[PDB]
Structures are given as structure tokens and as C-alpha cells.
Amino acid sequence: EGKIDEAADILCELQVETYGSMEMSEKIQFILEQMELSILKGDYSQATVLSRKILKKTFKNPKYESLKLEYYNLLVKISLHKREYLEVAQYLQEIYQTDAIKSDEAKWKPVLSHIVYFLVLSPYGNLQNDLIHKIQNDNNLKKLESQE
Amino acid sequence: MFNNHEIDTILSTLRMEADPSLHPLFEQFEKFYEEKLWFQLSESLTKFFDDAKSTPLRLRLYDNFVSKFYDKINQLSVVKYLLASLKDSKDFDESLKYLDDLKAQFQELDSKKQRNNGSKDHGDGILLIDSEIARTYLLKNDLVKARDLLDDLEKTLDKKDSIPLRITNSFYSTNSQYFKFKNDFNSFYYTSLLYLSTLEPSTSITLAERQQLAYDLSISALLGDKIYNFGELLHHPIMETIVNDSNYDWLFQLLNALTVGDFDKFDSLIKVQISKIPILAQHESFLRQKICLMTLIETVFVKNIRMLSFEDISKATHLPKDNVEHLVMRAISLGLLKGSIDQVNELVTISWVQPRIISGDQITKMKDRLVEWNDQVEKLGKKMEAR
Numbered sequence: 001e002g003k004i005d006e007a008a009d010i011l012c013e014l015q016v017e018t019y020g021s022m023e024m025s026e027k028i029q030f031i032l033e034q035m036e037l038s039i040l041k042g043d044y045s046q047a048t049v050l051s052r053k054i055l056k057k058t059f060k061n062p063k064y065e066s067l068k069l070e071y072y073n074l075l076v077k078i079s080l081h082k083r084e085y086l087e088v089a090q091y092l093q094e095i096y097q098t099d100a101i102k103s104d105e106a107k108w109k110p111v112l113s114h115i116v117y118f119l120v121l122s123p124y125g126n127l128q129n130d131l132i133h134k135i136q137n138d139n140n141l142k143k144l145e146s147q148e
Numbered sequence: 149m150f151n152n153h154e155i156d157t158i159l160s161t162l163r164m165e166a167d168p169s170l171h172p173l174f175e176q177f178e179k180f181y182e183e184k185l186w187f188q189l190s191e192s193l194t195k196f197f198d199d200a201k202s203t204p205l206r207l208r209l210y211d212n213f214v215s216k217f218y219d220k221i222n223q224l225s226v227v228k229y230l231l232a233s234l235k236d237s238k239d240f241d242e243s244l245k246y247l248d249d250l251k252a253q254f255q256e257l258d259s260k261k262q263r264n265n266g267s268k269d270h271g272d273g274i275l276l277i278d279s280e281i282a283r284t285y286l287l288k289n290d291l292v293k294a295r296d297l298l299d300d301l302e303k304t305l306d307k308k309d310s311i312p313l314r315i316t317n318s319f320y321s322t323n324s325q326y327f328k329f330k331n332d333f334n335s336f337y338y339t340s341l342l343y344l345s346t347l348e349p350s351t352s353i354t355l356a357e358r359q360q361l362a363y364d365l366s367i368s369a370l371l372g373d374k375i376y377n378f379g380e381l382l383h384h385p386i387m388e389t390i391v392n393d394s395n396y397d398w399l400f401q402l403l404n405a406l407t408v409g410d411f412d413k414f415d416s417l418i419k420v421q422i423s424k425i426p427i428l429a430q431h432e433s434f435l436r437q438k439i440c441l442m443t444l445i446e447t448v449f450v451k452n453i454r455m456l457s458f459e460d461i462s463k464a465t466h467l468p469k470d471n472v473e474h475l476v477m478r479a480i481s482l483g484l485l486k487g488s489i490d491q492v493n494e495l496v497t498i499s500w501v502q503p504r505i506i507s508g509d510q511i512t513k514m515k516d517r518l519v520e521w522n523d524q525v526e527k528l529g530k531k532m533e534a535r
Contacts, residue, residue, distance in 0.1 A: 135295075139291070139292070139295060140292055
């Protein structure tokens with residue numbers, strides 16, 4: 001219908017009321033709808049707080065890469081609106097570790113390029129020092145070499 | 149000829165009465181093919197001495213001797229030549245097969261003692277075997293996989309390590325080939341130099357191995373600027389374990405060119421193989437500044453003087469001031485200079501960075517200084533003694 005405001009509100013009451021932590025798979029979906037609604041509304045904040053809480057919970061539990069990536073895809077759309085490049089680098093840095101183990105290196109080597117590349121955009125990076133050292137940052141792909 | 153049979157019998161018989169690894173028809177083949185003092189391989193202590201003056205082919209013939217071997221002389225001895233034979237015969241496809249045939253924990257540990265690796269002398273199989281699989285794949289195939297193999301050679305090296313030179317020299321040789329491929333010539337120059345110093349006391353003192361490694365050293369020094377200048381070349385041999393000419397002519401000319409700083413002498417020394425490469429020419433200017441800088445600084449240094457002008461460095465390089473300004477700025481970035489350039493004073497105030505090494509001139513001067521210092525201190529000491 002186009003009732004963005006009304007959908008966002010009904011979702012907000014629900015997720016807290018249903019679940020502290022009992023079932024993640026169902027909780028995460030509801031959270032996903034909210035995030036989508038939150039970008040359009042201009043209400044940046046509610047999503048950011050929700051993304052942070054859910055992420056911690058999933059990492060502690062049995063891990064699944066997929067879930068994480070879905071949090072991130074929404075976040076960056078909010079991040080563009082603000083503009084904290086540091087913020088995107090960190091959030092992507094922790095998902096890089098989940099990618100390391102689980103996922104094949106074709107996804108992985110572009111993610112590496114992307115984190116160093118957010119850190120170029122912003123002035124300095126503490127974080128950058130850690131990444132430049134790696135041995136998979138200075139071989140392989142074109143894109144890795146260009147970035148180093 | 150007939151030395152295969154003569155040696156092998158007398159040693160087999162002398163030890164245990166039944167000839168334990170010798171069998172009559174294996175001997176017949178090796179006699180038939182060869183006509184030399186050395187045989188392509190042999191058995192026991194004799195195998196060490198007796199290497200091919202052609203190509204080992206009788207490596208498959210030897211495997212029969214390997215099942216029989218242990219009773220006569222130990223198991224640890226087998227890999228020393230047999231895995232090295234496979235690397236020499238340049239058959240890629242068979243080299244790969246045998247490492248899987250012999251492998252690890254199937255003939256390489258029942259009750260024997262483990263030392264690992266066997267380039268020179270001998271040890272247990274495993275760490276040798278790992279070096280061979282990794283070497284044959286690196287040359288053959290993808291770079292990305294050649295790196296992953298390097299990493300595995302690395303984790304195994306760290307876990308288990310030995311007191312002989314054999315392990316160290318194996319790690320060095322495997323990695324060097326990779327660098328040679330890459331345009332990372334500076335890292336190749338660091339690597340090949342390390343291998344040089346391990347090599348000359350022991351392990352691979354065959355002339356072939358000195359000659360290839362030397363050639364790689366000369367090409368890399370010119371391409372790089374990674375570690376000091378031509379002092380490293382004087383101390384260790386790449387022109388006096390082997391030839392002084394035929395692409396080691398270039399070395400003596402490199403020494404003349406660096407001191408003088410002539411571009412023409414740089415142009416003439418390089419021949420087509422080394423020259424075509426895009427890498428060298430930038431790195432020629434880097435080597436020239438470092439050497440010239442070391443000469444001016446020693447001169448002024450006699451107490452604590454480190455002030456050298458734009459004019460001294462411009463002169464040395466034979467480039468105007470503006471080219472030098474950009475050039476020093478690139479060189480400080482690297483950290484080959486740890487002084488600082490004050491643009492509008494037109495003076496460079498330099499905080500030491502120089503290595504100061506290889507002495508003959510420096511010792512005479514040092515001796516003079518040591519004495520002076522001792523006197524200065526002595527007076528201080530006298531005053532304390534007094535009250």
C-alpha cells in the first residue's frame with residue numbers, strides 16, 4: 001500500500017515482545033523488514049542499534065555467514081547517507097573472519113580489497129596496519145596489487 | 149666398465165656374509181649401459197661417490213635395492229640420493245609419482261630414529277619429501293598454488309628443524325625460484341645472498357650449483373637496491389669460486405660505475421638479458437646515491453660532523469639540484485636516509501643511517517679515535533681520584 005510508518009511501528013513492538021534470544025532464524029527476518037523500512041523513512045538510528053545487537057548474538061551462537069551478510073547489505077545503504085567510512089571498515093572486518101573459514105576465496109579477496117579501500121577514503125586508519133601485513137594482500141588478483 | 153660389480157661385491161660380502169642388497173642381473177644391466185668409473189647410481193657408501201656423468205635412468209632399477217637396503221646400511225641414507233636423482237633427471241611426471249609411492253609412515257617409520265631432511269648427509273624422509281613435492285609443482289604450475297606450497301614448506305620448517313645446514317639450504321632454494329619469476333627482484337637479491345653464505349661451507353658444493361646461484365646473484369644485485377652496495381659481493385664469492393668473466397665482467401664494471409657515477413659505464417656493462425627488464429634502471433640511481441653518500445659522510449666524520457650540502461651530493465651524482473631534490477625525497481621515503489633536508493638553507497643535516505662496514509681504512513682511523521677518547525676519559529678519572 002505504501003504505509004511505511006505504520007509497518008515500521010508494528011514491527012518495533014513485536015521483536016522485543018516475542019524473543020529475547022529463543023529462536024534466531026525467525027527473529028532475524030522480522031529485523032530484516034525493519035531495516036528495509038528504516039532506510040526509506042530517513043530514520044537511520046533504529047536500524048543501526050538493531051544491527052549491532054543481532055550481530056553479537058549470532059557470532060556467539062552457532063555461526064552462519066549468510067545471516068551476517070544480510071545485516072551488512074542494509075547497513076552500507078545507511079552509511080552512504082551519513083558517511084563514516086571507518087564504521088563500514090570495522091563491520092566488514094569482523095565478517096572477513098567469518099568469510100575466511102566458510103567461504104571460497106573468490107568472495108574473500110574482493111572483501112579484503114574493499115576494507116583497505118574504505119580506509120583510503122577516510123583520513124588515516126589504525127585498522128589499515130593490520131591488513132597491509134597479510135600475504136594474500138600482495139599476490140594474486142590485479143585488484144589486490146593495485147590496492148597495496 | 150666392471151667397477152660397479154667389483155665394489156658392490158666386496159662391501160656386500162664383507163659386512164653380512166650373504167650379499168644383502170646386491171643381486172646379479174641388476175649389475176649386468178648397469179655394466180651394459182655404462183663404460184665409465186662412476187655408475188649412475190650404486191648402493192650403500194658407494195652410491196654417494198658414484199653419481200651420473202650422464203643422467204640417472206636406473207632410478208627405477210634402484211627401487212628394488214631400496215626394499216632390500218636397510219639390512220646392509222640404514223634407511224635414512226636412501227633419500228639422500230634417489231629423491232635428488234628424480235630432481236636431476238628432469239622427468240616431471242615420474243618425480244611426482246615416487247614421492248606418493250614412498251611417502252610417509254609406510255617405510256619411513258617402523259622403529260627407526262627421525263632426524264628429517266637429507267640434502268647433505270642424511271636424515272629421515274619426511275622433511276626432504278615435502279621439499280621435493282613443493283619444488284616440482286612450483287616450476288611446473290600456477291603461481292598461486294606455488295605460494296600455497298611455499299607456506300606448507302614454511303610451517304613444516306618451523307615445526308621440525310635440525311642442527312646441519314641441509315634444512316636451511318633447502319628452504320632457501322625452493323623459495324628463490326618463485327622470486328626469480330616475480331618482478332619482486334629486490335626480495336630475490338636478499339634471498340639468494342642468504343643461500344650463498346649457507347652454501348659455501350657445506351651442502352651442494354658442486355660447481356654447477358655455485359655457477360647458477362652466482363649468475364642469479366649478479367642479475368638481482370643490478371635489479372635491486374635492497375641491501376647495501378658492492379661490499380656484499382666482495383666478501384662472498386660469485387666470481388672466485390667460478391669464472392671472473394662471461395657475465396661476471398659486469399661486477400667489476402659496476403664497482404667502477406658506482407664510485408664515478410657515469411651513466412655511460414652503466415649503459416655499457418648491461419647486455420641484453422639483464423637490460424631488457426624494466427626494473428633495473430630506477431634502482432641504478434638508488435645504488436649511486438647510497439655509495440657516494442657513504443663516501444662524503446666518512447670524510448667529514450671525525451668527531452661528530454654530519455653536515456653535507458646540496459652542492460656535495462649534486463656533484464656526486466652528476467645531476468642538478470632540482471633532480472636531486474626529488475631523488476632524495478624518494479630515498480628518505482624508503483628509509484635509506486634518516487637525515488632531513490632543509491630546503492631554504494640549502495644544507496642537508498643528516499642523522500646517521502650509514503652501515504660503516506668492511507674495514508681497512510676505517511680501522512687505521514678508529515685506532516686514532518679510540519686512543520684520543522681514552523685520554524679524555526683518563527683526565528676525568530684523575531680528578532675523581534684526587535677528590
